[PDB]
Amino acid sequence: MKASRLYTLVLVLQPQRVLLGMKKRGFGAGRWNGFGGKVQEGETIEDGARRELQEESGLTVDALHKVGQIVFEFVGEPELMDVHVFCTDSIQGTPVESDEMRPCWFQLDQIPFKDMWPDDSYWFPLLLQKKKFHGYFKFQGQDTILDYTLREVDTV
């Protein structure tokens, strides 16, 4: 059995567009992603997702709704990433570029799948259909899925 670390991922999804963030530096730059990071001690996962959204994008929201959970496993890494996925209820401000991340809106017929994590091609369509899901993806490096599961669920 492995240990898992908790992470969040927030999709700012509006009726016709979605906000994504492009990684500018570090390792993994060039890829568009939702907003999130590691859950911290003592906060609920949802509150951690809100905190990370604000830190990462500048957007503040009072509430999210949970839409999925995805476990990532990487060859050579014993720790699993347990990612809790949320969508925004409403927003009321503008996103901000940081030294690390550039936010950009995409129309929902221009979702930039080829420049997103490969798993997003599988689960983000469910998110657009307002379905809930559980997933698991095993990666070799950043680009190659060796095994995965995806299932629609009634409760995340």
Ligand X SMILES: Nc1[nH]c(=O)nc2c1ncn2[C@H]1C[C@H](O)[C@@H](COP(=O)(O)OP(=O)(O)OP(=O)(O)O)O1
User: C-alpha angle with apex 140: 120 to 24, nearest 5 degrees?
Assistant: 60
Question: Is 8 annotated as a binding-site member?
Answer: yes
Verify binding: residue 37, ligand X, rule CB under 6 A.
yes
Q: How many whole angstroms separate alpha carbon 114 and alpha carbon 109?
A: 13
Please, which residues have CB within 8 angstroms of residue 144's CB and are 6 or more apart in sequence?
Answer: 118
| 73 near ligand X, rule: CB under 6 A | no
- Upper half-sphere CA count for residue 51 (Cβ side, 13 Å): 13
Instruction: Say if residue 37 carries a ligand binding annotation.
Output: yes
Q: Is 83 in the site for ligand X (CB under 6 A)?
A: yes
Give least dist CB 83 to ligand X, A. Answer: 5
99 is in an annotated binding site: no
Give the residue numbers of the binding site. Answer: 8, 23, 27, 33, 35-38, 52, 55-56, 100, 117-120
Give the residue numbers of the binding site for O(6)-methyl-dGMP. Answer: 8, 23, 33, 117-120
